[PDB]
Design a protein around this ligand. Structure first.
Ligand SMILES: *[C@@H]1O[C@H](CO)[C@@H](O[C@@H]2O[C@H](CO)[C@@H](O[C@@H]3O[C@H](CO[C@H]4O[C@H](CO[C@H]5O[C@H](CO)[C@@H](O)[C@H](O)[C@@H]5O)[C@@H](O)[C@H](O[C@H]5O[C@H](CO)[C@@H](O)[C@H](O)[C@@H]5O[C@H]5O[C@H](CO)[C@@H](O)[C@H](O)[C@@H]5O)[C@@H]4O)[C@@H](O)[C@H](O[C@H]4O[C@H](CO)[C@@H](O)[C@H](O)[C@@H]4O[C@H]4O[C@H](CO)[C@@H](O)[C@H](O)[C@@H]4O)[C@@H]3O)[C@H](O)[C@H]2NC(C)=O)[C@H](O)[C@H]1NC(C)=O
Ligand SMILES: O=C(/C=C/c1ccc(OC(F)(F)F)cc1)N1C[C@@H]2[C@H](C1)[C@H]1CN(C(=O)c3ccc4[nH]nnc4c3)C[C@@H]21
Ligand SMILES: [Ca+2]
Ligand SMILES: [Cl-]
Ligand SMILES: [Cl-]
Ligand SMILES: [Cl-]
Ligand SMILES: [Cl-]
Length: 808
């Protein structure tokens, strides 16, 4: 109930909100149906259009007009955006040559450059090149300012998850908006697009930019706009707000366009009907810039042109139905579309079992266009598991396809040619970024980046201190003319020990055997140097990783590799080695197949044993540095130390073996040497962060040897591949993965075939940022390079996507 008896006269688009049952006049009261009776009349005027014609010049101020062409409108801050052009012989912003904005050129009373966020829904990255003919304002913006070829959205590539990620720097799993539709069991409540629960505050976590701004005494415009408010009225309001006195004037503003997403759903991404909405976005941009120019603010304001996600070609005839797979289709709830999430329909049903559900959905058709997953087994680069609103079962859907429950849901609930929500590395889902203004760089292209990083930047452009988020502060300083934030290396928490030979072979009772009792100042003093760390300059190219938590561990040196061995987890945390282009792959000699040697540098108490693996019929073992890449028959024995050993399921050994035997060598041939860093990851609560010892849910049977949920590798080389990895002078190039350590290969439908047909594709699916591995391990890589720490932060946020070029 609202007593809408009050007025909006003098209060059109007020910046603060008033609590019920007074009537509101803000740009959102329509969605609440609590506007004052006179809102439309006074605030939403439309008379005479949005443009000054040649006969409106110097008119008598008629208050009924949407905008004004009178003499006093510059003073009132309510002219039409084309006023100066038509009535004063000025030119449009777009028709001017772009001159570099070396310093902010602001009017007195402006204490900082304002920030304007122009967000465009569904605006696919390829539109920047492909529609460039019909978007002249956006093209001037793009090419005079700072831009990226694309910006990666978060998963799911839906509207609300991405808009709220843009505002918070958080993953949807952390901000809580994990889709366009959600169920929260703790609340016992649901979240819809069509409804009024979505307005309730409990859904929305994190600290969005406008709240961060408010709490630090920077004033914000109100970011959201009722759908019925036309885009022209949205621009003029922003401009009016900018005309306000210094003490009332916000420092940050937002504009939202429902286009091109709206038309994109109807006509597909490249529908001939798409040119017009794109024409109309550009005109709105024109309107804004012409408006800023009138205010003399076009060389003072920072403008961000950002999309939320792309748009893919999708039709009704590309739907997969769960009813063609399952028996009890009426005992499941499905959230459908471009992703799927499944739960029990009634919780008082105890004959519901997700494992049977998943099995019924696994490679059951040769053509299958979706893949079932328990959420914790989703790839880690999606960060889509640590929220109670995320269903245990998740279907990842092929681009261009839908999943539904029964055919009756698709025709009675085609009409659409476009959709989004797919895996965020999919090309059709990438969006745009362009930054324009005094604080952004001039004519600069920057590499692609993820939208999680923007919150920090917008905080910088405003002199704000960002709330704790998932961005990597300083990773986007290279977009900026001037920073404000200078990132600093975290301090190492745990210092390593450097253990020597302390123990005799016979002290070890590990139940391991190795036929190694066969073997001179020449090649015996030499191996002393190796165990002390003579060859470390070759295998540890960027400094040891720093341990950022409290723990006890040892650095172990070897001819071929170096490890950070954890006395707590009974295995290395990391193992580092260099494979040059000239390196050769050997095999494991026949006699040394089952060989495991005691490490006389580490006590039997802090060692694994072979007996545990013998007794654990499910579990087996592998090695972090691969025997296959030993540089000599003598060095090969180093590879068989109990301290290079890690638990592995037989099914996973097939993946690992091929990575170590085939792919490392291949990468080294292609990239001119690689440095490899590998290790275990423990994330049993699927929060993307390292488990502590007391959070391990699985041990190798009858032992205190913890089983990793994942294994990672960081593979580094020179960006200039003419230079060998171990003599790289300039920038580095990197690719990484976090492979799930699973006891079956149910994820790979071609796994009964040869490793050469499926393994590499699995790896590509679980591509990772070096930053993802940091959070999951509590380590910090690249401590000692010749590169700037800003450059290294950018390297760490790099994701290698394996998608071909944008456009082709
Ligand atoms: C991506 O970035 C984000 C953000 O940086 C990372 O997420 C952060 O991770 C931290 C560590 O995991 C975590 O610390 C927690 O905090 C717990 C309480 O946190 C509440 O307060 C948060 C702050 O709000 C304030 O914000 C500003 C400052 O920024 C202030 O000025 C304001 O005044 C605000 O008050 C708040 O954000 C958080 O909100 C969550 O819950 C809300 C419901 O109330 C949701 O609306 C909201 O969406 C958040 O929900 C998410 O996160 C929670 C985890 O908190 C999770 O449950 C959900 O799935 C969802 O994803 C809270 O309201 C606090 O309880 C923790 O302390 C425990 O652990 C320590 C360990 O040392 C114990 O010593 C301690 O005693 C305590 O344990 C107790 O409970 C145990 C069981 O849990 C029990 O066994 C034990 O015996 C004890 O009783 C800890 O400090 C941050 O909260 C979290 N922040 C966010 C925003 O998520 C994230 O890690 C990054 N991701 C990656 C991959 O890197
Ligand atoms: O005025 C705003 C947002 C302003 C904003 C400005 C900058 C921002 O970022 C920053 F924080 F960085 F500034 C963030 C937000 N709105 C009203 C609209 C919009 C959010 C949704 C789309 N929608 C669907 O109903 C909808 C739209 C497209 C869809 N595709 N598929 N389903 C769909 C559903 C209704 C909702
Ligand atoms: Ca964890
Ligand atoms: Cl959704
Ligand atoms: Cl297998
Ligand atoms: Cl620990
Ligand atoms: Cl594309």
């Amino acid at each position: 109930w609202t007593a809408t008896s009050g007025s909006c006269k003098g209060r059109c688009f007020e910046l603060q909100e008033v609590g019920p049952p007074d009537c509101r006049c803000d740009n959102l009261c329509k969605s609440y149906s609590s506007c004052c009776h006179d809102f439309d009349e006074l605030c939403l005027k439309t008379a005479r259009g949005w443009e000054c014609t040649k006969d409106r010049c110097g008119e008598v101020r008629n208050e009924e007009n949407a905008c004004h062409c009178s003499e006093d409108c510059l003073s009132r801050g309510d002219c039409c955006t084309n006023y100066q052009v038509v009535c004063k012989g000025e030119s449009h912003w777009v028709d001017d040559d772009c001159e570099e904005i070396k310093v902010p050129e602001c009017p007195a009373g402006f204490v900082r450059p304002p920030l304007i966020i122009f967000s465009v829904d569904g605006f696919r990255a390829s539109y920047m090149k492909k529609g460039s003919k019909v978007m002249p304002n956006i093209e001037k913006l793009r090419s005079c300012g700072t831009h990226a070829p694309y910006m990666r959205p978060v998963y799911p590539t839906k509207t609300f998850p991405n808009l709220y990620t843009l505002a918070t720097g958080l993953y949807p799993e952390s901000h809580g908006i994990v889709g366009n539709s959600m169920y929260d069991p703790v609340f016992d409540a649901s979240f819809h697009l069509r409804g009024r629960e979505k307005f309730n505050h409990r859904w929305w976590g994190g600290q969005p930019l406008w709240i961060t701004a408010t709490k630090q005494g920077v004033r914000a415009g109100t970011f959201f706009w009722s759908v019925s408010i036309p885009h022209e009225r949205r621009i003029l309001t922003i401009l009016q707000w900018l005309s306000l006195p210094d003490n009332e004037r916000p420092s940050v503003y937002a504009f939202y366009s429902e286009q091109p997403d709206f038309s994109g759903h109807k006509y597909g991404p490249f529908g001939p009907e798409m040119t017009n909405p794109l024409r109309e976005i550009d005109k709105t941009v024109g309107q804004l810039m012409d408006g800023l120019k009138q205010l003399r603010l076009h060389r003072c304001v920072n403008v961000i042109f950002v999309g939320d996600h792309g748009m893919e070609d999708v039709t009704c005839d590309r739907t997969e139905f769960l009813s063609n797979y399952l028996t009890n289709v009426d005992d499941i709830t499905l959230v459908p579309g471009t992703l799927g999430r499944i739960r029990a329909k009634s919780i008082n049903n105890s004959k519901y079992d997700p494992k049977t559900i998943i099995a019924a959905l696994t490679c059951k058709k040769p053509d299958q266009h979706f893949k079932p997953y328990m959420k914790q087994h989703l790839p880690k680069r999606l960060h889509y598991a640590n929220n109670r609103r995320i269903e245990d079962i998740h279907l990842l859907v092929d681009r261009r396809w839908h999943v539904a429950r029964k055919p009756l849901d698709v025709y009675k609930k085609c009409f659409f040619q476009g959709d989004h929500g797919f895996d965020n590395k999919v090309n059709s889902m990438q969006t745009v970024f362009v930054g324009y203004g005094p604080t952004f760089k001039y004519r600069t292209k920057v590499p692609p980046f993820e939208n999680i990083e923007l919150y920090n930047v917008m905080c910088d452009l405003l002199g704000l201190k960002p709330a704790p988020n998932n961005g990597t502060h300083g990773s986007l300083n290279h977009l900026l003319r001037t920073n404000t934030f200078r990132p600093t290396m975290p301090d190492e928490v745990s210092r390593p020990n450097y253990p020597g030979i302390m123990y005799l072979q016979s002290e070890f009772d590990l139940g391991c055997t190795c036929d190694d009792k066969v073997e001179n100042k020449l090649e015996e003093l030499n191996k002393r140097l190796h165990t002390k760390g003579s060859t470390k300059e070759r295998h540890l190219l960027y400094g040891r990783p720093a341990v950022l938590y409290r723990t006890s561990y040892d650095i172990l040196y070897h001819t071929d590799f170096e490890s950070g061995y954890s006395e707590i987890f009974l295995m290395p945390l990391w193992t580092s080695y260099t494979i040059s282009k000239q390196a050769e792959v050997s095999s494991i000699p026949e006699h040394l197949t089952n060989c495991v040697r005691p490490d006389v540098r580490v006590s039997p108490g802090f060692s694994q044993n072979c007996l545990a693996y013998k007794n654990d019929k499910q579990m087996s073992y592998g090695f972090l540095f691969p025997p296959y890449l030993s540089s000599s028959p003598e060095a090969k024995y180093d590879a068989f130390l109990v301290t290079n050993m890690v638990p592995m399921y037989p099914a996973f050994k097939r993946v690992w073996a091929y990575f170590q035997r085939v792919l490392v060598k291949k990468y080294a041939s292609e990239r001119n040497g690689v440095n490899v860093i590998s290790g275990p990851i423990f994330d049993y609560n699927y929060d993307g962060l390292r488990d502590t010892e007391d959070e391990i849910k699985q041990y190798v049977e009858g032992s205190s040897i913890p089983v990793p949920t994942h294994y990672y590798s960081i593979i580094t080389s020179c960006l200039d591949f003419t230079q060998p990895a171990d003599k790289c002078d300039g920038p580095l190039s990197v690719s990484s993965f976090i492979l799930p350590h699973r006891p079956d290969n149910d994820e790979s439908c071609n796994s009964s075939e040869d490793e050469s047909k499926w393994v590499e594709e699995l790896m590509k699916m679980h591509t990772a940022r070096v930053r993802d591995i940091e959070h999951l391990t509590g380590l910090d890589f690249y401590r000692k390079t010749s590169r700037s720490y800003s450059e290294i932060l950018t390297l760490k946020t790099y994701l290698h996507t394996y998608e071909s070029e944008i456009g082709g």
